[PDB]
């Protein structure tokens, strides 16, 4: 029942169980969706499709309000907003929009990490001789 | 800021707080690839004998 759902800004399968159906919302993983379901007082055995619409609204609101529902501060994928200074858990459309902002900040100060991203290289200090391998030969002639 | 061989003039911005001074003075410069040499591939290292 209810094969298709619509949460936040991503389609959600109803045939899969609640935790792993909610993982498709980007910015929410296997563990984070597990805590949210437990805090929302919703049974884990039943699938996401057969949830009541009142259960859906409880699940979604607790996602954008993790701190208000006694969720530990160290699950949040941002624990210190460098612009704001507050913990925040970011949902699907926000991480992509926010990812540019972090790259924009790094680029506009001409830092090394931002420069590496702009050039299109590994930024965590990886070795890049035998393992970059983006294109093709390039033979000897 | 000294970067290996020369000093790079960098003006500190309020957005630059929380990073090392080595961020803003690159030490290796980007790599602009040229042309492969003789030993770049297996089928090219053979030197002819006449």
């Amino acid at each position: 029942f209810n094969h298709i759902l619509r949460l936040l800004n991503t389609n959600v399968d109803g045939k899969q169980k609640v935790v792993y159906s909610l993982t498709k919302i980007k910015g929410v993983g296997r563990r984070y969706s597990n805590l949210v379901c437990k805090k929302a007082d919703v049974d884990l055995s039943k699938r996401a499709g057969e949830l009541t619409s009142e259960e859906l609204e409880r699940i979604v609101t607790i996602m954008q309000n993790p701190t208000a529902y006694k969720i530990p501060a160290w699950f949040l994928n941002r624990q210190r907003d460098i612009v704001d200074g507050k913990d925040s858990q970011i949902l699907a459309n926000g991480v992509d929009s926010k990812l540019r902002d972090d790259l924009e900040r790094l680029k506009k100060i001409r830092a090394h990490r931002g420069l590496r991203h702009y050039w299109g290289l590994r930024v965590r200090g990886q070795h890049t001789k035998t393992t970059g391998r983006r294109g093709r030969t390039v033979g000897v002639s | 800021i000294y970067s290996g061989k020369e000093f790079n003039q960098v003006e500190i911005k309020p957005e630059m707080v929380g990073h090392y001074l080595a961020e803003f003075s690159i030490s290796y410069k980007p790599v602009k690839h040229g042309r492969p040499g003789i030993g770049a591939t297996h089928s090219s290292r053979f030197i002819p004998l006449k």
Partner: peptide
């Protein structure tokens, strides 16, 4: 998360609690 006016006059210990963990260790 602190305004720039007080940020430049902030004390050492108060500066510590805000900055990144690597900055704190230094």
């Amino acid at each position: 998360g602190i305004d720039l006016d007080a940020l430049l006059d902030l004390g050492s210990d108060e500066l510590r609690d805000v900055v990144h963990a690597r900055a704190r260790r230094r």
